[PDB]
RNA sequence: GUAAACUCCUGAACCCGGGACGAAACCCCCGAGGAGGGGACUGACGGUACCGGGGUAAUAGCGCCGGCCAACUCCGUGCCAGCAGCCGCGGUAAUACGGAGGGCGCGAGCGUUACCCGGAUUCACUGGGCGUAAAGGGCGUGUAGGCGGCCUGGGGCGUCCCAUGUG
RNA sequence: GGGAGCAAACCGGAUUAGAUACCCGGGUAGUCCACGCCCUAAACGAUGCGCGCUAGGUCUCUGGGUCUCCUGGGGGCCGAAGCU
């Protein structure tokens, strides 16, 4: 089955395209305690309806771009803005490192 | 350390160094005699060793013990290093090869042969 | 009457004008070979004495041991303050799997089927200690039900 | 705050039955007194009930011990010989049916949550499944 | 290859009637009723504490000993007995019982173990009819251990059949002299051997 | 050291004769060139394996022998000659050097060098520690992350079970 | 900027085989103030922070309650269990 998975979208610069960031869970192979990562994939919005905060279901799809093997398969909600947070925050440090 | 710190930092590996760069791992290494020469040893004891310097394939440079009592080995005598630091002497990282090339055996030896490349007297 | 088997002995030294002056000890198992087990460290001016006081401070200290079939009625851990030592039960055709302290009490016992390990420290005196504290906490399937029971 | 109030009461317990006191309280819990019926129904603890100190809602356990011991220091032998947090909540430990942990070759018992509820473990392969253990005691 | 050098040497080491002669080993000595003591120029000194790995060393030295096998053979066999699901300790004896060298030494048409692989080399034994010249050949239960036709005739077999005569033989074996064949009838239990051996301590030294 | 010598027995080698399995299909006739049946040719290894017959007692070597590690004495040597994996051995009384006698461990192998895992629980999840042994940041504020009290309900991501495909 | 006392460096006296030191007589940065850097230490309890749990005896600081005692929060010593 086309695999699918839900996210937040956290970037509605491009046109006719979003960025979704999704975590999984998962144990650690060797030290057990349940570990979060996350990965951001570039969606298709050819209606340029979906926004920024939002969360939403993508689906594994014929590739649109370089980037762009998944289409945006329907929304879940609006304000999430508090999860964009953590994300530019997460950027925001960056800075703070390299001299 | 905490489990997080584990997940985070992770238990570093071991790694360890080789005692005798014969180098490519080889189990020996032929080269060829320069200096054939005895030196006194360190603190405890006290005996006139027979060493000799060798410059290998490897374009490298290194003093060898010579095992077995007496030698025939020249300012150019090729033989073969087989490696075995000799706790005594300083900087000796290698033992060279009896029986092997210009390396003759020991003679009237009779237990042990083996390790002197001896053949079996009649 | 029982078996006597001497796990070590060392001579000590103590100093003095002139000199030094020496000891012995002398750590002895002791067992019948199917239940009945002491140890016992004895410490003379002279190596035989020793070894004879070992001899009747094993004899004194005992302690009556679960057995079943040979092995143990449970694994167990157990840290002398120092040294750590753990049985661990096995099906009989095993064997004494053991350091050589720990096995000759073990033999001596009664004891076949075993599985051992010694971690932390590992001397010899200690080791010892440990091994026979490790046994008195050895609990039997009656043994249990007898404190839960609570009747 | 207190981070995991499982081992606590597991401590509480612990620390107590070392001093060999009569019972002690432990703030009140419906997940809490699961692990204490089966610690009651194994036959660990006599029993327990729920109280009130000041307002606060607690369960009293009651601790059980052996008989006197003769010779030097005549120390009652314990009951609850070893309590012990396993999954603890900074590293989870879930555990499926094939492997779950077999305490001191039956002489012990082995709690842990279930999709089913509270089981230990020979309860558990009963039904025959798994979840978090919760802890072992023996 | 075997110990082809002296044979009553062995007995001497472990202080014990090691039986691996034959006549003599039943006259007065296996070498052992005049010197109950070790080889070399010394030995019947003070002897020494053995430790736990002398010991341990030595059962072994003699269970091997016993059926004059290889090192190399004889641990492959203890090995193998770890394998299976069993008490290994007896096991690997049932199995180092079922080698045909040795069978036909229980079955008595030869002296000695070591006569009994000369006569089995020498291909004088069939199982089921079939030849067989391997010492080594595992020695299946229902097997008939028989001696080869154009055998029987021969004096040196005949002998050891005239001292097998009415005298019993071992209980997981039938003997029938008046066939001159034999059976293997099942793999011995513990006791049914009565090997100077405790099995136990061969299993620690295999070990380290 | 029953070791040998010696007596007896068996008979690797070598000789004599026989001597394959691996190969039934394409192909040929009947039937239809089909399904079904019957018939024939083809073997590098190979005169090989194996069988029967006759038949000679017919290669043993290497490591070790102070402790770990187990197998002891004699002599030569004299901090020289040499040993050595660690601890160490030898400076005229060495079971530690060399030879010998003897002994232990392996055996058509025995030792050596190299490299990997083990031991090493010595990177410790299983399974380690930080007052003085190596190890708490000079002290705070706080970002991300990690973690989180008591009661009820919905969802069922983690977690658990069954089935099936896959492995 | 300020500089009384003290005082590395420096000078002299003495001591000593020597005495760039301990002792003595002098003595300058500095020690003080403003503002700006430096960011180390046996920055030691050589003991990271928070929360719960596990005898007591005694001295002291601070708060509340009618008070030869009870109840909080600090500073010490001895010591249950336990740890080492
Ligand atoms: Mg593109
Ligand atoms: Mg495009
Ligand atoms: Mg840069
Ligand atoms: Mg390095
Ligand atoms: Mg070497
Ligand atoms: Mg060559
Ligand atoms: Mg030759
Ligand atoms: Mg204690
Ligand atoms: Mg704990
Ligand atoms: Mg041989
Ligand atoms: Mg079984
Ligand atoms: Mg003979
Ligand atoms: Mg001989
Ligand atoms: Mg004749
Ligand atoms: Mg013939
Ligand atoms: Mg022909
Ligand atoms: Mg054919
Ligand atoms: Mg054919
Ligand atoms: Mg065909
Ligand atoms: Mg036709
Ligand atoms: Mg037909
Ligand atoms: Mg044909
Ligand atoms: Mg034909
Ligand atoms: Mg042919
Ligand atoms: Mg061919
Ligand atoms: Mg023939
Ligand atoms: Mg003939
Ligand atoms: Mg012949
Ligand atoms: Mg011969
Ligand atoms: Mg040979
Ligand atoms: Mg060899
Ligand atoms: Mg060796
Ligand atoms: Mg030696
Ligand atoms: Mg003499
Ligand atoms: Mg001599
Ligand atoms: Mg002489
Ligand atoms: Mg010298
Ligand atoms: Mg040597
Ligand atoms: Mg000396
Ligand atoms: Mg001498
Ligand atoms: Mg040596
Ligand atoms: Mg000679
Ligand atoms: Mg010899
Ligand atoms: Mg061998
Ligand atoms: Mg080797
Ligand atoms: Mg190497
Ligand atoms: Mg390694
Ligand atoms: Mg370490
Ligand atoms: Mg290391
Ligand atoms: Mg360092
Ligand atoms: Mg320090
Ligand atoms: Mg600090
Ligand atoms: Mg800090
Ligand atoms: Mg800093
Ligand atoms: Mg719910
Ligand atoms: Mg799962
Ligand atoms: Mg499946
Ligand atoms: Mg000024
Ligand atoms: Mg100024
Ligand atoms: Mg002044
Ligand atoms: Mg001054
Ligand atoms: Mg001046
Ligand atoms: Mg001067
Ligand atoms: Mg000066
Ligand atoms: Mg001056
Ligand atoms: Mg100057
Ligand atoms: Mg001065
Ligand atoms: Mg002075
Ligand atoms: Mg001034
Ligand atoms: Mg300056
Ligand atoms: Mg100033
Ligand atoms: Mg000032
Ligand atoms: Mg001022
Ligand atoms: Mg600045
Ligand atoms: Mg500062
Ligand atoms: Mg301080
Ligand atoms: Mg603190
Ligand atoms: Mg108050
Ligand atoms: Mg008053
Ligand atoms: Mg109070
Ligand atoms: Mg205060
Ligand atoms: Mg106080
Ligand atoms: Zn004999």
């Given at each position: 089955p086309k695999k699918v998975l839900t996210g937040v979208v956290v970037s509605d610069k491009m046109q006719k395209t979003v960025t979704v960031l999704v975590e999984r869970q998962f144990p650690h192979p060797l030290y057990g305690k349940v570990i979060k990562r996350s990965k951001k994939y570039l969606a298709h919005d050819p209606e340029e309806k979906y926004k920024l905060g939002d969360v939403v279901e993508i689906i594994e799809s014929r590739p649109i771009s370089k980037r762009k093997?998944?289409?945006?398969?329907?929304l879940v909600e609006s304000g999430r803005m508090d999860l964009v947070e953590k994300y530019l925050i997460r950027r925001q440090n960056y800075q703070s490192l390299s001299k | 350390p905490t489990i997080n710190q584990l997940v985070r930092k992770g238990r570093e590996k071991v790694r360890k160094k080789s005692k005798?760069?014969?180098?490519?791992?080889?189990?020996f290494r032929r080269g060829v005699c320069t200096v054939v020469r005895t030196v006194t040893p360190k603190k405890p004891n006290s005996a006139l060793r027979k060493v000799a310097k060798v410059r290998l394939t490897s374009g490298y440079e290194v003093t060898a013990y010579i095992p077995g009592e007496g030698h025939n080995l020249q300012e150019h005598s090729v033989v073969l290093i087989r490696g075995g630091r000799v706790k005594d002497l300083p900087g000796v990282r290698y033992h060279i090869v009896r029986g092997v090339y210009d390396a003759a055996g020991v003679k009237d030896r009779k237990k042990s042969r083996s390790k002197y490349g001896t053949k079996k007297p009649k | 009457d029982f078996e006597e088997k001497m796990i070590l002995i060392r001579r000590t030294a103590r100093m003095q004008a002139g000199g030094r002056r020496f000891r012995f000890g002398a750590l002895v198992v002791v067992g019948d070979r199917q239940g009945r087990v002491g140890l016992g460290f004895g410490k003379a001016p002279e190596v035989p004495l020793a070894v004879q006081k070992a001899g009747y401070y094993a004899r004194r200290n005992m302690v009556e041991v679960p057995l079943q079939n040979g092995t143990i009625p449970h694994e167990i851990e157990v840290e002398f303050g120092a040294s750590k030592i753990v049985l661990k039960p096995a099906a009989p055709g095993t064997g004494v799997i053991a350091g050589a302290v720990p096995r000759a009490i073990l033999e001596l016992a009664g004891v076949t089927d075993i599985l051992t390990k010694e971690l932390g420290s590992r001397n010899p005196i200690n080791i010892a200690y440990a091994t026979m504290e490790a046994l008195r906490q050895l609990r039997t399937k009656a043994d249990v039900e007898r404190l839960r029971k609570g009747e | 705050m207190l981070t995991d109030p499982i081992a606590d009461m597991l401590t509480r317990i612990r620390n107590a039955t070392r001093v060999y006191k009569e019972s002690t309280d432990v703030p009140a819990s419906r997940f809490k007194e699961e692990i204490l019926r089966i610690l009651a129904r194994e036959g660990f603890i006599k029993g327990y009930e729920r109280v009130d100190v000041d307002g606060k809602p607690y369960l009293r356990v009651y601790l059980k011990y052996g008989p006197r011991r003769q010779g030097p220091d005549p120390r009652p032998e314990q009951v609850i010989h070893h309590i012990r947090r396993i999954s603890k909540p900074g590293r989870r430990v879930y555990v499926g049916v094939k492997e779950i942990p077999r305490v001191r070759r039956g002489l012990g018992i082995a709690i842990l949550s279930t999709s089913k509820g509270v089981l230990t473990d020979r309860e558990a392969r009963k039904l025959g499944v798994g979840g978090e253990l919760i802890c072992e005691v023996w | 290859g075997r110990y082809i050098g002296p044979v009553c040497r062995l007995c001497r080491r472990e202080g014990?009637?090691?039986?691996?002669?034959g006549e003599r080993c039943y006259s007065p000595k296996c070498a052992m009723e005049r010197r109950p003591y070790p080889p070399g120029?010394?030995?019947?000194?003070?002897?020494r504490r053995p430790s736990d790995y002398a010991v341990r060393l030595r059962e072994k030295q003699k269970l091997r000993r016993i059926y004059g096998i290889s090192e190399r053979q004889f641990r492959n066999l203890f090995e193998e007995a770890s394998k299976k699901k069993g008490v290994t300790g007896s096991v690997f004896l049932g199995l180092l019982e079922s080698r045909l060298d040795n069978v036909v030494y229980r079955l008595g048409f030869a002296v000695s173990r070591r006569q009994a692989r000369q006569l089995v080399r020498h291909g004088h034994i069939t199982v089921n009819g079939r030849r067989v010249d391997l010492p080594s050949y595992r020695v299946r239960p229902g097997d008939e251990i028989a001696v080869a036709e154009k055998s029987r005739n021969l004096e040196l077999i005949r002998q050891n059949l005239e001292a097998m005569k009415g005298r019993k033989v071992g209980p997981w074996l039938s003997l029938d002299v008046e066939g001159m064949k034999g059976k293997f009838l099942r793999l011995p239990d513990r006791e049914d051997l009565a090997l100077p051996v405790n099995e136990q301590l061969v299993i620690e030294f295999y070990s380290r």
């Amino acid at each position: 089955p086309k695999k699918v998975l839900t996210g937040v979208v956290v970037s509605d610069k491009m046109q006719k395209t979003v960025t979704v960031l999704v975590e999984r869970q998962f144990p650690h192979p060797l030290y057990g305690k349940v570990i979060k990562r996350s990965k951001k994939y570039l969606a298709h919005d050819p209606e340029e309806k979906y926004k920024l905060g939002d969360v939403v279901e993508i689906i594994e799809s014929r590739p649109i771009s370089k980037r762009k093997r998944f289409r945006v398969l329907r929304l879940v909600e609006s304000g999430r803005m508090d999860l964009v947070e953590k994300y530019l925050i997460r950027r925001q440090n960056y800075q703070s490192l390299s001299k | 350390p905490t489990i997080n710190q584990l997940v985070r930092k992770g238990r570093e590996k071991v790694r360890k160094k080789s005692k005798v760069p014969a180098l490519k791992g080889a189990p020996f290494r032929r080269g060829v005699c320069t200096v054939v020469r005895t030196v006194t040893p360190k603190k405890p004891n006290s005996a006139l060793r027979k060493v000799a310097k060798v410059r290998l394939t490897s374009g490298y440079e290194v003093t060898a013990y010579i095992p077995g009592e007496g030698h025939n080995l020249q300012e150019h005598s090729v033989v073969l290093i087989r490696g075995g630091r000799v706790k005594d002497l300083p900087g000796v990282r290698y033992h060279i090869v009896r029986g092997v090339y210009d390396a003759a055996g020991v003679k009237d030896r009779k237990k042990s042969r083996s390790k002197y490349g001896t053949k079996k007297p009649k | 009457d029982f078996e006597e088997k001497m796990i070590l002995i060392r001579r000590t030294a103590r100093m003095q004008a002139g000199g030094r002056r020496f000891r012995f000890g002398a750590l002895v198992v002791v067992g019948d070979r199917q239940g009945r087990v002491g140890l016992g460290f004895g410490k003379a001016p002279e190596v035989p004495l020793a070894v004879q006081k070992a001899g009747y401070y094993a004899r004194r200290n005992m302690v009556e041991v679960p057995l079943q079939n040979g092995t143990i009625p449970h694994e167990i851990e157990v840290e002398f303050g120092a040294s750590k030592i753990v049985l661990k039960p096995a099906a009989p055709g095993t064997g004494v799997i053991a350091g050589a302290v720990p096995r000759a009490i073990l033999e001596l016992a009664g004891v076949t089927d075993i599985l051992t390990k010694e971690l932390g420290s590992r001397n010899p005196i200690n080791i010892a200690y440990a091994t026979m504290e490790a046994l008195r906490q050895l609990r039997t399937k009656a043994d249990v039900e007898r404190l839960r029971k609570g009747e | 705050m207190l981070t995991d109030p499982i081992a606590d009461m597991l401590t509480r317990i612990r620390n107590a039955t070392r001093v060999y006191k009569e019972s002690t309280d432990v703030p009140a819990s419906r997940f809490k007194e699961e692990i204490l019926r089966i610690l009651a129904r194994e036959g660990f603890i006599k029993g327990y009930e729920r109280v009130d100190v000041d307002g606060k809602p607690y369960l009293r356990v009651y601790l059980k011990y052996g008989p006197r011991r003769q010779g030097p220091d005549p120390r009652p032998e314990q009951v609850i010989h070893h309590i012990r947090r396993i999954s603890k909540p900074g590293r989870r430990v879930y555990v499926g049916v094939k492997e779950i942990p077999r305490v001191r070759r039956g002489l012990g018992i082995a709690i842990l949550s279930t999709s089913k509820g509270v089981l230990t473990d020979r309860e558990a392969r009963k039904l025959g499944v798994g979840g978090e253990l919760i802890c072992e005691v023996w | 290859g075997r110990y082809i050098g002296p044979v009553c040497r062995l007995c001497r080491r472990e202080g014990v009637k090691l039986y691996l002669k034959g006549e003599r080993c039943y006259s007065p000595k296996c070498a052992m009723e005049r010197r109950p003591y070790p080889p070399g120029q010394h030995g019947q000194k003070r002897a020494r504490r053995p430790s736990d790995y002398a010991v341990r060393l030595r059962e072994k030295q003699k269970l091997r000993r016993i059926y004059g096998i290889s090192e190399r053979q004889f641990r492959n066999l203890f090995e193998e007995a770890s394998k299976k699901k069993g008490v290994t300790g007896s096991v690997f004896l049932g199995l180092l019982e079922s080698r045909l060298d040795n069978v036909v030494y229980r079955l008595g048409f030869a002296v000695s173990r070591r006569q009994a692989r000369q006569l089995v080399r020498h291909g004088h034994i069939t199982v089921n009819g079939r030849r067989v010249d391997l010492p080594s050949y595992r020695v299946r239960p229902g097997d008939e251990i028989a001696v080869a036709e154009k055998s029987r005739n021969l004096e040196l077999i005949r002998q050891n059949l005239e001292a097998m005569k009415g005298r019993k033989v071992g209980p997981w074996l039938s003997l029938d002299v008046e066939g001159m064949k034999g059976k293997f009838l099942r793999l011995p239990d513990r006791e049914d051997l009565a090997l100077p051996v405790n099995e136990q301590l061969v299993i620690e030294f295999y070990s380290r």
